[PDB]
Design a protein around this ligand. Structure first.
Ligand SMILES: Cc1nc2cnc(Nc3ccnc(NCC(C)(C)S(C)(=O)=O)n3)cc2n1C(C)C
Length: 300
């Protein structure tokens, strides 16, 4: 159908520097880095991904394809690739890491406004992916990255098996739709509302399918009013068409974000605060002089 005219930027190894390791797992190793292009007088904070088998290079390049094809404020985009012996993905630096660890590490300062705004942002990212006919297949709080506590983006399109985040049709029939992503969105919201609790803790992955067929779902988080929990529950209907659309989720959560204390009950809310550009030394190693974020540099 429509031709994909996305630009794949090839970047020189010499144009960027690795500073430290941010994470190292199955995906390979992710580094904090700086990208100093040609003679543009700019330093772009970046995240460098690297895993030498010919089978592995094919997988890192299929991920680069999807990641270079997206452009949305709530979706992680590929900045470029470096054609070294291994092959490196140059991505935007999300200084605060993944949302799962962020809600766990900062629960005592996470208020209703932040939780509800993150829900809007994730729904907006997902609705963009829907408009682009792209089905995520791995939406979880671990795959939502934090640029600033007030700005989150969806990542990991290396699937565009996590049973405990999957819709019933995905588990039993391997059916993946935008509606099956809505189920995963529901679990992601549950993870946030519980400040990073593990869904179905203790229960093995094979029992999940049987549990779901019975009618059993994730419990109501203590901070959740029936209004927020009803939305999570609607994301887990057997009939996929009965589940909300991401555009409905944008609207529903944003109505709630206008009067957040009416929808989430948190002890200490109002006296809670998270880092923001208002903070003295919010952006803080050596040279922080001509530094600019990827969202402001070049622009597609
Ligand atoms: C601790 C940490 N700090 C980060 C700063 N910036 C990014 N940048 C980006 C940008 C886009 N995608 C990704 N993906 C990283 C990933 C490990 C979640 S994955 C599975 O998608 O490769 N990272 C990733 C970061 N991390 C990872 C390892 C969770």
């Amino acid at each position: 159908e429509a031709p994909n005219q996305a630009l794949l930027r090839i970047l020189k190894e010499t144009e960027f520097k690795k500073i430290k390791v941010l994470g190292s797992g199955a995906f390979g190793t992710v580094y904090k880095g700086l990208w100093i292009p040609e003679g543009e007088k700019v330093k772009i904070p970046v995240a460098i991904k690297e895993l030498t088998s010919p089978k592995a290079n094919k997988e890192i390049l299929d991920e680069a394809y999807v990641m270079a094809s997206v452009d949305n404020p709530h979706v992680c985009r590929l900045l470029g690739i470096c054609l070294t012996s291994t092959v490196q993905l140059i991505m935007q630096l999300m200084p605060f890491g993944c949302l799962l660890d962020y809600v766990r590490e900062h629960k005592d300062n996470i208020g209703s406004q932040y939780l509800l705004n993150w829900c809007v942002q994730i729904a907006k990212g997902m609705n963009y992916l829907e408009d682009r006919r792209l089905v995520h297949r791995d939406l979880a709080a671990r795959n939502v990255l934090v640029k600033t506590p007030q700005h989150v983006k969806i990542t990991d399109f290396g699937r565009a098996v996590p049973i405990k985040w999957m819709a019933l049709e995905s588990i039993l029939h391997r059916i993946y739709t935008h509606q099956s992503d809505v189920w995963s969105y529901g679990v992601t919201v549950w993870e946030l509302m519980t400040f990073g609790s593990k869904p179905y803790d203790g229960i093995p992955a094979s029992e999940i399918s049987s549990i779901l067929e019975k009618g059993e779902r994730l419990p109501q988080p203590p901070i959740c009013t029936i209004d927020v929990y009803m939305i999570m529950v609607k994301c887990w209907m057997i009939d996929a068409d009965s589940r909300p659309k991401f555009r409905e989720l944008i609207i529903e959560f944003s109505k709630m974000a206008r009067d957040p204390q009416r929808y989430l009950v948190i002890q200490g809310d109002e006296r809670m605060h998270l880092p923001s550009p208002t903070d003295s030394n919010f952006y803080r190693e050596e040279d922080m002089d001509d530094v600019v974020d990827a969202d402001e540099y070049l622009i597609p």
